[PDB]
Design a binder for this molecule. Structure first.
Ligand SMILES: CC(C)C[C@H](CNC(=O)c1ccncc1)Cc1ccc2c(c1C(=O)O)OCO2
Ligand SMILES: CC(C)C[C@H](CNC(=O)c1ccncc1)Cc1ccc2c(c1C(=O)O)OCO2
Ligand SMILES: [Cl-]
Ligand SMILES: [Cl-]
Lengths: 148, 148
């Protein structure tokens, strides 16, 4: 549980927002890319795994699951790649809700930044800090408890 | 102490590596940029602060300290900007050693990636995971203890 993350890809302003959600806490990391490719997903995972102890990743679609570059990055970083098939079906709805919510925050900050990428990072900040505990507090507690 | 970070800028392959070090743990985040501008530093800080509870940043030089964009980002994210003047003089030597160490790791992984940015992220991973606790474990413990 402490090492489980879910990939999520959403669209805005003709661009792609790639999101990694720490399932147990709701904590996110996100980036803007021109389009989802195996290479971009692989690089994103390498960054993520150097920052948090990523054990398992539920990939967001079959193309990324299949991608030889994504597979290489998961091998390199010691990540077990799994499908993102929501056998538990509330999972989809939770991600759907998060995308809607992230887009709402992006709209609220949008005019404070020229570039979408900046607005996305502001939205990540607001999401992770919103409180009772915040997502940022929850992920730290979960992992700290796991270490010990 | 749990919220104190230090900026560090180093050069390799004609490019700039921007590093943020969590002083109490030795944990790092890093990115490759073409050159160190206020805008790049500001964006880097926005990303950092959405991911970890950044209270104080010791900026790496006077241009970034002065930068109106860096100041804007610190205001937005609730970061106290301080100078990076090592009144305590072992500080500079610790950063020097870290840059040398990071460059060593980059050399060790360099041939496994086409692009410098990828090698830097591999180096971040190795640095943060190296154990007795790792930097990644230490930062989580420090912040978890602080929350309580
Ligand atoms: C996971 C590692 C082991 C391999 C991948 C794929 N690279 C190769 O197969 C390769 C190895 C050696 N020489 C050339 C290519 C690295 C990678 C992933 C994602 C990226 C990248 C890179 C990159 O190569 O910089 O660039 C931006 O997005
Ligand atoms: C910290 C926030 C409040 C302000 C900065 C500076 N921007 C403005 O002053 C501005 C505000 C409104 N319309 C246009 C410009 C945002 C920022 C920081 C770093 C970056 C950026 C941006 C960006 O504007 O996207 O782009 C890549 O590196
Ligand atoms: Cl880690
Ligand atoms: Cl946070």
């Amino acid at each position: 549980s402490p090492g489980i993350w879910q990939l999520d890809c959403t669209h805005l302003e003709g661009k792609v927002i790639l999101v990694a959600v720490h399932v147990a806490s709701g904590y996110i990391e996100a980036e803007v890319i021109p389009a989802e490719t195996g290479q971009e997903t692989a690089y994103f995972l390498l960054k993520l795994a150097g920052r948090w102890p990523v054990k398992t990743v539920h990939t967001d679609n079959g193309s990324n699951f299949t991608s030889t570059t994504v597979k290489a990055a998961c091998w390199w970083a010691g990540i077990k790649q799994e499908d993102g098939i929501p056998y538990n079906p509330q999972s989809q709805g939770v991600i759907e809700s998060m995308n809607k919510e992230l887009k709402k925050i992006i709209g609220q900050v949008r005019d404070q930044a020229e570039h979408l990428k900046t607005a996305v990072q502001m939205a990540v900040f607001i999401h992770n800090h919103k409180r009772g505990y915040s997502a940022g507090e929850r992920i730290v507690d979960i992992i700290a408890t796991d270490i010990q």
